[PDB]
Amino acid sequence: GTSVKPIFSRDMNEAKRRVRELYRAWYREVPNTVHLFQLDISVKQGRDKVREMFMKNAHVTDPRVVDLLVIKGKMELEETINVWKQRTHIMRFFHETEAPRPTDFLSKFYVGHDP
Amino acid sequence: TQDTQLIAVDEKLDITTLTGVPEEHIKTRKVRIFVPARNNMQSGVNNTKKWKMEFDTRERWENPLMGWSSTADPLSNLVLTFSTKEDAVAFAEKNGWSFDVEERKVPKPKSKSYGANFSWNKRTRVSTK
Amino acid sequence: DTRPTIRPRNDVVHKQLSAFGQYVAEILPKYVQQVQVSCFNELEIFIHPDGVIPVLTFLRDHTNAQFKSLADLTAVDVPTRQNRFEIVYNLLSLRFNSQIRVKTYTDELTPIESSVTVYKAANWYEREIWDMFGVFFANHPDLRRILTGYGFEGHPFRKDFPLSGYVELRYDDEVKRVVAEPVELAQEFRKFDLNSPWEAFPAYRQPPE
Amino acid sequence: TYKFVNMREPSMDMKSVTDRAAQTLLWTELVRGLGMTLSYLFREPATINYPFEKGPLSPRFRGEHALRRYPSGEERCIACKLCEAVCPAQAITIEAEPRADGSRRTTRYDIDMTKCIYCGFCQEACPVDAIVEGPNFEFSTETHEELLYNKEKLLNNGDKWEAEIAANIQADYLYR
Amino acid sequence: SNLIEVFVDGQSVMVEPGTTVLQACEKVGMQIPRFCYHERLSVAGNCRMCLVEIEKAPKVVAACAMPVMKGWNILTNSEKSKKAREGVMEFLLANHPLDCPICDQGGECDLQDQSMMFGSDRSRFLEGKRAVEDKNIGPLVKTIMTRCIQCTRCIRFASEIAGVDDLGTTGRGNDMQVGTYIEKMFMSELSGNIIDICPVGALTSKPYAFTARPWETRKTESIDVMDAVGSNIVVSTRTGEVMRILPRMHEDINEEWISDKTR
Amino acid sequence: GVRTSPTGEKVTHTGQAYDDGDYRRVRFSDRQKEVNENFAIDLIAEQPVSEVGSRVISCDGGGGALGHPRVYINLDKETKTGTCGYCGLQFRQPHH
Amino acid sequence: AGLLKKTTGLVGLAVCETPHERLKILYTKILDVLGQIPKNAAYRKYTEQITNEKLGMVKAEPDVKKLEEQLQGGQIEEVILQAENELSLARKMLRWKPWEPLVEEPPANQWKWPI
Amino acid sequence: NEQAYSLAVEKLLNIQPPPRAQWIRVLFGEITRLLNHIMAVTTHALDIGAMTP
Amino acid sequence: ASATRVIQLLRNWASGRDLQAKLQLRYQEISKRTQPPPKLPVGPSHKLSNNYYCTRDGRREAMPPSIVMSSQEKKAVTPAPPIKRWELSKDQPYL
Amino acid sequence: FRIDELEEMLTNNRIWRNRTVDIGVVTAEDALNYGFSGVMLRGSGIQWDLRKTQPYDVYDQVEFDVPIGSRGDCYDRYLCRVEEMRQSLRIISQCLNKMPPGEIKVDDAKVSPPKRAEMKTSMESLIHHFKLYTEGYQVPPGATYTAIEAPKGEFGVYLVSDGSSRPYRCKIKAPGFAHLAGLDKMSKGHMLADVVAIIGTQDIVFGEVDR
């Protein structure tokens, strides 16, 4: 039950290590993917998107889950590095065409039936 | 007996971030599990023998063209089957959807006898067949 | 004859396959869990995950088994069972022409060891499962996404995944590119309620409780 | 049984080697193909003068959907919605109603031609031969909305291609 | 106590004395196809689809009204039982009119489902069928009495459940017609429930009459608010629109019936 | 019969007619609202009432196999005319 | 063997001009490897049975063409190829050790397939 | 492909097609084989350069 | 869409064959497109007697997969008897 | 008379062979482990064909030879395809000469729609057609892997049905998937014109590999 099989990491410390050089690679990547892909993104506003995506899954505490996010980010890194990904997919993280979505209950009531 | 470097992991699964469901669909959506009541137009029974999960219905507007039933939530015509309610609730929590539980209503077995159609004094005597 | 519509029954192949099933069950009792042969003469072997490499090798190498062809490799997601995903390996023999099937189980996270070495055809098939069910494969040479679009999410063949997906893409002149947008159908998929409430096959009735 | 395709190894006598050397040097199989293509040049060109001449067809041809009607003029569709439950692409949509006369005709009957995959499942599903696919294929349109048909458009299709559909059904109902 | 052991096609179960055979079979999970017996209504043994073979017994017995006895392995899947079901349905499905595309019961007809499961695949009826003139019994129930099978469920519902004993039978033989003889006005508060007890489309819902084939409408559970009883119901909605309200089984609130006002 | 809307549009056999404001009428400007004139409501009414003299009458809709499934309507009620649900021809006893 | 066959017909392997001694040496090696395998294992019984049978027939009949006929394994080249594979299998699962009882039962109902 | 799918389906159902159905199936599957081999060879020659075949 | 004999002999010699026996064209030899109404036959179970579906159902006559071995001196057995060797082509063994 | 006509243009031509002969060899042993099928196997030299070894339908009663490759190269596979054309013509003749008299669909109406005559006259046919086109034939629970000799290669379906009117999971084994999986080992030093000569007898349509 509680006992389970790991993917790579044994404890939160080593998975915490893997996300470390994943962020390493993303940092060293962002500028030259901006240069290579002719991005309209800027360098700083490239890095902070990586930071916000890394902070998005802050709640995760199961190790195996952390290995899963790290290997999926690894696949993301390969897709970006050797130009298999395309500029549109890179922009996909930045929500340009997506209109701003209200947050307060009052605006939700004004717009339509939705929780 | 199955040595694969086993580790006690007490907290429940959080595969939510793995499933790729968007944040508002994993948070706002409320799913209920239930045994679907049989269609009263039918006497068939083998449709209330499974645990199905379905999600809250959302906006259904009519498109300008033919008044179709265009909708926005993808998880509207999505129903999942399960043998026992424990499997369904485990799936619900591990995925991360706020879940609601309804107990499996079953017909009470009633004593039925054809000899009740006729009687000497009881009111149960029928008046026509 | 008397049964011109019913398919012919070949009991000889059935008995012979059952004999080979007892054979393979005796040879590898460590990983084999349950072997059975279907009515239409198709044998299936239910093995523990740790036997993905050993059993396959025994089926790929043994003189009296002689299976070297990976017909296909597939996962069948079923959310009910505790380990939802089940992986099916389909093998075909050449010297002893026949089709065998071995089936293992895994959940979303517990990895299942990647065959590849036993059958180098599995590789691409292997990737599909990872890219289509979330079943990660241990030490697979390159487990990158194979089928779906770039930067995708989830694993579509999961039965919880909606039919229409989550996000489409289309031209936007405001940004002069194809952009991804949350789903908004022009007409919703009508889900018909088939499967009449009357029992079809008394033979396969689930026992009560 | 089987046949080996390429085991015809050559001999090595003086005649055979001279022939092979001549074929390699004095290009012969090259000339063989060069003369075959010449034979095809002088032949009768296979070409149909569209649109003056059209390709051969069959009475079973599946094309534009249409709603037929009885000889009395009444539409055959009783809105059983079998065709809607059959269309694999779900291109058919019906809303029924008790008409003023009473006969349960369709308030709405639209086929999304851009969703349709032209299978002929609807006609074989129809128990009154109401929905059918006419022999017309010449309905390439300019706007996407032009393709999305309506009940009135289907009725007009059944009233324009009608002698066609009646003749084809008369020549095909025995097969089906 | 008094629980008597009764086998069903093999495995045995504990059965209360006086229990009908069909309830004993239901105790295991396999269900006798039926048209005359409703669980909350009196039994009549009329459809004869409840026939089943008793092990070492010459003639088949009706599982609807049969007090089960000691032992008595119920051969549900016996060849004689299948033949009896086949013949009884062939008789049922002889004069049935060709209205399946035009009858609202289509797709949830019961009779259609039993034909799919336990029935033939071809008709040897070489003669003409029977037609019965329609008797109007309201703006609330559509009446096509040529489709009726004389299962007597409507009559027993009128007598016991509603209490308005006006729905009966007339004549004899194959010309027996179930109706009201007089052009009477069946206007009880529970009349609409006859729409859901009629196995065939002989009685249907007039307000909903041919608005949607019921294999499309999604079903969502809810509670009636027209009355303080709060009867459990199911709303059948297609394409973002409410079509009809059907009763849900609760056994504590509304059994499986609702008022015409609620419906 | 086809009749014109107060705006001017041709009503359909179902009764559809876009109202006065009804912004969804720009679709028809520079185009036409396709309506079929051969109304099925009235094209079945003028058909003669068949006077076949028997209690129960078969109807396939004409054309044999090409018609609708064979239905047996009942020519019993003296106060009205029986009709096949599929086609719609009104059958009646020849005044008994 | 008379005129040695030019090609076996399968391009993945060539002709062994001295096949009998190859059968002998490979069979002896795999018999040794099975001698390693503990007696109680059913694998050793079955494979020793088939291999000692095969060695008996190959050392009995010295004509290659009849060797393929009573060996029912096609051309002798794919036969020694399969013998090498059998050696490899026995060696590889020497330390896999499958003769032990099952590692553990499947979890509850993991094989019933009416859902 | 239709032959494959159909054969799977009525293999599940323990049903065999009538003999004429089998003969039509094999005849049209072989016509399909001719079609597909023509595809392969002709389009291959197109890639290599040959346009006439 | 036949030709002149002068061209007819030129194409045949260039093609090295007698192609007039059959051209890629298709002349009047085609099947007529107004065939008489075919009376289609029936199947085996078309009789009105002894056609009980109980003795003819195929789906109902399907048992669950027969369990062989479950987790809850025989010789060696092969999945199939070794496949034989095909024969060479009698017509054209080698192309 | 046109199959041979194509042959004469391609078979003995200098540059058709030179561009294609002995480019991208595939070893017979390494072919079957890679999951290769169809002519890809037959080109290399393994005598295997589902039409003969596992005869589905009436393929067993049909007499035909298969073309078996010699060198396992591109040219051998092309010749195998053409000889398959010719054996296809012979098979066509055989089935054309001996088609029997009988119905077209299984007589059991519960699985195949009834004929339109009994549709409009008989109750049973009407109900069966209504349910068949409304619900369909509910399939008994079970999983099958059905494989046939599609012209590309062996084509298979893993169809697993839960026991209702709808399937539970169908998987497509397309002959081109394992082919493209092995396409890396297929060309390991040949030129770009060679890789495009390879994807030809690789005969990979991108409609079934991609699913």
Ligand code: SF4
């Ligand atoms: S051919 Fe007709 S029935 Fe079939 S998908 Fe297209 S519109 Fe629907």
Ligand code: SF4
């Ligand atoms: S199947 Fe025919 S009759 Fe039924 S709804 Fe469709 S078109 Fe109308």
Ligand code: SF4
């Ligand atoms: S009630 Fe009668 S007409 Fe209606 S679907 Fe059932 S059998 Fe057909």
Ligand code: SF4
């Ligand atoms: S009218 Fe309906 S409920 Fe009454 S007897 Fe006939 S079928 Fe049964």
Ligand code: FES
């Ligand atoms: S239950 Fe046997 S007839 Fe009604």
Ligand SMILES: [K+]
């Ligand atoms: K009813």
Ligand SMILES: [Zn+2]
């Ligand atoms: Zn009529």
